[PDB]
């Protein structure tokens, strides 16, 4: 586990950068190297908020396994969002 955090941050960073290029192409901008690093660090940190809420929401329902019900609650204020991620998830 010695390198787990570093490996997660790197994987999050390069995927974030790749995803941002789609936006750069669509809007005709260039994201600086520091801007991408900032976005991936915000994402890494926000993922922690998501994870801790999911864990607590499952415990509140007396479960030790997080389910799509807990994700729905996480997205309770973003019904448009929940409905898109559910649609993209079923694109599977």
């Amino acid at each position: 586990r010695e390198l787990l955090i570093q490996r997660l941050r790197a994987a999050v960073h390069y995927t974030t950068g790749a995803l941002a290029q789609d936006v750069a192409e669509d809007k005709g901008v260039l994201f600086s190297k520091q801007t991408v690093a900032a976005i991936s660090e915000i994402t890494f940190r926000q993922a922690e908020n998501f994870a801790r809420d999911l864990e607590m929401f499952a415990r509140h329902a007396k479960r030790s396994t997080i389910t799509s019900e807990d994700v729905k609650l996480l997205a309770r204020r973003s019904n448009s969002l929940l409905k898109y991620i559910t649609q993209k998830s079923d694109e599977l």
Partner: protein, 75 residues
């Protein structure tokens, strides 16, 4: 393109209070799509702010300007 299921599972688990907490496959796929949308929205908002200043180069100050509203629209 998107986050790998393994990345999302390990990322959530790293941040659990208890590492034994489990997450089922459906929830992992929903959370991967959510994080992809979050990244694209952050990038689009920062870009859309840099374009408001007549710039094609998006800098960290642009991220800083849009961050509170980005977080507000997701929580």
């Amino acid at each position: 393109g998107g986050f790998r299921k393994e990345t999302v599972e390990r990322l959530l688990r790293l941040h659990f209070r208890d590492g034994r907490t489990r997450v089922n496959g459906d929830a992992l796929l929903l959370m991967a799509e959510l994080l992809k949308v979050f990244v694209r929205e952050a990038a689009a908002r920062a870009a859309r702010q840099a374009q408001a200043e007549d710039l094609e180069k998006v800098d960290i100050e642009h991220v800083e300007k849009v961050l509170p509203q980005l977080l507000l629209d997701f929580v």
